[PDB]
Amino acid sequence: IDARNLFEYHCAKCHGLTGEANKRGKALKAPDLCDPGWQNSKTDKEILYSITNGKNKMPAWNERLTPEEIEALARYVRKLS
Ligand code: HEC
Ligand SMILES: [Cl-]
């Protein structure tokens, strides 16, 4: 699975290509995925859950993405630090 490319289409809209949240993401109170501080405040089961189910006001991706695709993405979110 090409998790980078799934990410940049689906996700980079808010988190930015590098995972520093851009002005769209900042305005929605997005975190900086790229931040080691943030990365260390979450687990993988937490990340997988939030992509699958949505997080506070944010929608779930388990319609548009397969479980496989969500896992690759979770592993990709980790590669941004
Ligand atoms: C804006 C329109 C977003 C898009 C598109 C995606 N995400 Fe997101 N994400 C966004 C916000 C505003 C937040 C914070 C929500 C809050 O109230 O805390 C998040 C959060 C995440 C997280 C962290 C989840 C957690 O429980 O802390 C992750 C791992 C994450 N987002 C990843 C992610 C992926 C993989 C996306 C594409 C499939 C994606 N997000 C889309 C804003 C937006
Ligand atoms: Cl999309």
Residue numbers in the entry: 34 to 114
Can you list sentences taken from the study reporting this PDB entry?
Anaerobic ammonium oxidation (anammox) is a bacterial process in which ammonium and nitrite are combined into dinitrogen gas and water, yielding energy for the cell. As anammox bacteria express a large number of small c-type cytochromes, these have been proposed to perform the shuttling of electrons between the various parts of the metabolic machinery. Here, we present the structures and biochemical characterization of two of these proteins from the anammox model organism Kuenenia stuttgartiensis: Kustc0562 and highly homologous Kustc0563, which show relatively high transcription levels.
In the crystal structure of Kustc0563, the heme iron is proximally coordinated by His47 and distally by Met91; in Kustc0562, the iron is proximally coordinated by the homologous His51, but the distal ligand is an imidazole molecule, presumably from the crystallization solution. The structures of Kustc0562 and Kustc0563 are highly similar, the main difference in the crystal structures being the presence of an axial imidazole ligand in the Kustc0562 structure, with an Fe–N distance of 2.1 Å. Given the high concentration of imidazole (100 mM) in the crystallization experiment, we believe this to be a crystallization artifact in which the “true” distal ligand, Met94, is displaced by imidazole. Indeed, when oxidized Kustc0562 was exposed in solution to the same concentration of imidazole as used in crystallization, a shift of the Soret band maximum from 411 to 406 nm accompanied by the disappearance of a charge-transfer band at 690 nm indicated a ligand exchange of methionine to imidazole. Spectropotentiometry revealed that Kustc0562 and Kustc0563 have redox potentials of +244 and +268 mV versus standard hydrogen electrode (SHE), respectively. Strikingly, however, despite the structural and electrochemical similarities between Kustc0562 and Kustc0563, only marginal activity could be detected when Kustc0562 was used as the electron acceptor. In contrast, despite the strong sequence similarity between the two proteins, the corresponding surface on Kustc0562 displays a pronounced positive charge, which would make interactions with the proposed binding site on the HAO surface electrostatically unfavorable.
